[PDB]
Design a protein around this ligand. Structure first.
Ligand code: HEC
Ligand code: HEC
Lengths: 157, 157
């Protein structure tokens, strides 16, 4: 259905060019910035329906923080991690909300080309317990809010 | 050439669906988060050349900061401002680097549907004095760095 690619053993392959996807929110930990992307076709469907289609892929990219002085602030430093989630009613028929969760790398677990779906206690439990909308933390993603509430991807006069 | 649209009097119209463009960096002021977008065709050209094509449009979107407690962090709150820049060797033949700068709204100047190019002392002066690359602060935008240095829009194994 969606953009997710899996190898023969069912592991999720590193999404390609996900930084060209739709950035839906950015968060800061008071040390790290996190950037969240939704693949463009799933975002288009969201705009029309306020729902995550079957096949939806999200990516959370982790960065350290750079310090700017003049001409003061913080900015995205080095890439230090990458997580993803994939919704698939068929492939993940037996997972909560049909979502699978993945780590490609974090402060040292080295990068893998392909990732295995993680146990529910590790990832899905928190999401299904706390996320506003279908196991995604849309309460923190104002791009999605404006898209769902108004069909827009930007301010309109 | 590019995606910029101008009205009859030469004012820049609010870009449409710019939140679907390529987010190249996010910055935090220690109070505000700023999100920076480059239109997809100009980003594609950047990937191939490490240069900003004639017609390049950038957008800087300003947000207040929300506070997350559990299950601690900061996230993008309310939209509070929007600036843009446009490179055009023909239309802005007489501007530094051929870039024009714009405010659509900020903490109260109300939103305009169309914006007039701002004086160089107000905007272009700082950019041309301090920005790393052709009046854009690419020193702070790691998406562009990885795209220029490696042709990639994401981590590759
Ligand atoms: C962000 C996240 C995302 C982005 C998409 C989404 O579902 O919102 C993914 C793909 C992911 N994480 Fe999850 N996570 C939590 C919260 C509050 C946010 C948004 C706020 C922010 O980024 O600052 C998330 C919450 C939690 C959590 C609470 C105790 C747990 C244990 C996890 N997340 C665990 C995981 C994963 C296990 C390694 C994993 C692959 C995640 N999250 C993916
Ligand atoms: C960010 C900005 C952007 C994003 C594209 C880019 O050229 O990098 C635009 C379109 C824009 N501003 Fe500029 N600005 C400055 C810096 C350091 C950054 C990136 C870091 C961050 O966001 O935290 C910018 C610097 C300055 C500055 C230094 C004294 C001045 C006076 C300005 N900027 C002024 C303006 C504008 C006048 C109202 C205007 C429309 C801008 N910037 C647009």
């Amino acid at each position: 259905a969606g953009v997710a690619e899996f190898n023969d053993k069912g592991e999720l392959l590193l999404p390609k060019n996900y930084r060209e996807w739709v950035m839906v929110g950015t968060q800061v930990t008071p040390t790290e910035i996190r950037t969240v992307y939704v693949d463009p076709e799933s975002y288009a469907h969201w705009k029309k329906t306020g729902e995550f289609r079957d096949g939806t892929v999200t990516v959370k990219e982790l960065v350290s923080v750079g310090d700017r002085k003049g001409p003061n602030g913080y900015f995205m430093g080095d890439y230090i991690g990458l997580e993803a989630s994939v919704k698939d009613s068929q492939r993940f028929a037996n997972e909560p909300g049909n979502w699978a969760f993945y780590i490609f790398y974090v402060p040292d677990t080295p990068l893998v080309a392909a990732a295995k779906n993680l146990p529910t206690a590790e990832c899905a439990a928190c999401h299904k317990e706390n996320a506003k909308t279908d196991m995604v933390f849309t309460q923190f993603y104002p791009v999605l809010r404006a898209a769902k509430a108004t069909g827009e991807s930007g301010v309109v006069a």
